[PDB]
Amino acid sequence: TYHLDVVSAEQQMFSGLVEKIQVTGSEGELGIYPGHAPLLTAIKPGMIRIVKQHGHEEFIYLSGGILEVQPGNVTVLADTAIRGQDLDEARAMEAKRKAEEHISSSHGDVDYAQASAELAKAIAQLRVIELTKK
Amino acid sequence: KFINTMSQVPTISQLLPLPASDDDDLKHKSWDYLYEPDPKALLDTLLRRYVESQVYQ
Amino acid sequence: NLNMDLLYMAAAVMMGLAAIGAAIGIGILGGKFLEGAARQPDLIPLLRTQFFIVMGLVDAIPMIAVGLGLYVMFAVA
Numbered sequence: 001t002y003h004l005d006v007v008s009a010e011q012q013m014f015s016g017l018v019e020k021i022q023v024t025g026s027e028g029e030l031g032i033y034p035g036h037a038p039l040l041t042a043i044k045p046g047m048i049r050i051v052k053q054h055g056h057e058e059f060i061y062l063s064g065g066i067l068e069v070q071p072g073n074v075t076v077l078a079d080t081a082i083r084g085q086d087l088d089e090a091r092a093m094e095a096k097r098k099a100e101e102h103i104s105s106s107h108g109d110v111d112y113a114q115a116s117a118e119l120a121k122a123i124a125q126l127r128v129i130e131l132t133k134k
Numbered sequence: 135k136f137i138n139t140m141s142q143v144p145t146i147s148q149l150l151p152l153p154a155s156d157d158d159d160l161k162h163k164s165w166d167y168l169y170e171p172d173p174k175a176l177l178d179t180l181l182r183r184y185v186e187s188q189v190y191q
Numbered sequence: 192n193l194n195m196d197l198l199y200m201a202a203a204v205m206m207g208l209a210a211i212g213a214a215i216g217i218g219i220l221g222g223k224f225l226e227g228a229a230r231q232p233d234l235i236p237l238l239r240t241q242f243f244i245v246m247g248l249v250d251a252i253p254m255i256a257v258g259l260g261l262y263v264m265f266a267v268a
Contacts, residue, residue, distance in 0.1 A: 041170035
């Protein structure tokens with residue numbers, strides 16, 4: 001099949017051959033296939049499903065970044081990414097507590113422009129923490 | 135540049151314009167290419183990350 | 192007599208509707224074909240192969256219409 005490379009300014013999150021992947025996007029989620037149509041796009045707060053050889057998935061949090069599909073070997077660049085068991089349900093629930101406070105504590109437009117991103121971070125974590133259980 | 139624990143080499147290299155005289159990836163070719171809408175912004179921010187990465191490294 | 196005057200009209204309406212249907216259908220389908228090449232040319236032959244595969248079913252019914260238009264115009268007269 002094909003090779004996937006996942007990196008962030010802090011660490012290399014993954015590197016190796018993979019069977020298929022489902023990845024977040026700017027408008028909506030997208031599934032990549034071997035030899036897929038080459039594309040590049042920014043990604044909204046979410047995660048990526050890494051289904052490797054023999055069908056074993058792992059779940060990587062992608063709080064923000066860009067994905068590249070020009071070659072057969074694909075590439076994910078992450079402004080912030082967290083490995084699926086360094087995070088936990090308690091951490092996403094703390095993010096939920098934070099975001100639900102800031103929604104009540106943001107009252108203008110600029111501060112809501114920040115609280116909405118805080119909420120998006122919390123929601124993407126609350127999503128990946130559930131996907132992690134598979 | 136740190137080529138050895140006890141030897142290092144001084145280097146100069148160009149960032150802009152992003153050199154197209156690098157080896158051409160003639161192997162990867164396609165029958166369809168899709169750019170996500172507002173390609174200018176995505177490409178501009180992507181190149182800003184490129185220059186950020188090169189300078190910081 | 193009146194028979195031939197109405198039968199040429201019947202064949203005319205049948206073949207006209209067939210022409211509109213077939214022409215616009217292949218116009219849309221070939222429009223997507225030509226779009227694919229503008230994205231990149233290396234599956235022009237393979238998209239052209241699927242193009243004929245689909246264009247056959249496009250032309251399925253309008254040529255029944257054309258066959259019966261020709262029959263009415265030349266055999267019932």
